């Protein structure tokens, strides 16, 4: 009954995880050669990356 | 471009391992499978 007003702070811990962002259309592993990997072949063009 | 006939040569896309090997080697590794397996040498495509 003597508690003081408080503010909640959250966080999370990740390790041995190595965030990944797959190059598929729906971020889904429907195959090793992703859906967009083939489209870049047929398009046959160059694109930088930032 | 005709599946880029270098992915096919490198098995990035194309015929599966059980298919481009000569029938007779896949048959061989099929029999002597319990001992001295050959499955993990040849790789096969998994195109989406």
């Amino acid at each position: 009954q003597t508690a003081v007003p408080s503010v909640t702070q959250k966080k999370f811990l990740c390790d041995r995880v190595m965030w990944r962002i797959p190059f598929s259309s729906n971020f889904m592993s429907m195959g090793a050669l992703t859906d967009l990997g083939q489209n870049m072949l047929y398009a046959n063009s160059a694109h930088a990356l930032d | 471009p005709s599946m880029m006939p270098q992915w096919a040569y490198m098995h990035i896309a194309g015929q599966d391992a059980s298919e481009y090997l000569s029938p007779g080697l896949v048959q061989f590794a099929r029999a002597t499978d319990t001992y001295f397996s050959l499955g993990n040498k040849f790789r096969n495509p998994t195109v989406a």
């Binding site: - | 499955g39 096969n44 495509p45």
Partner: peptide, 26 residues
């Protein structure tokens, strides 16, 4: 039909035609 595979009495043991293989980090 190279039968140098273990037997199960007769009818040599087993083998699936499709099983030579692939895996990557994905």
């Amino acid at each position: 039909f190279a039968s140098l595979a273990p037997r199960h009495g007769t009818r040599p043991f087993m083998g699936t035609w499709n099983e030579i293989g692939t895996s990557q980090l994905n």
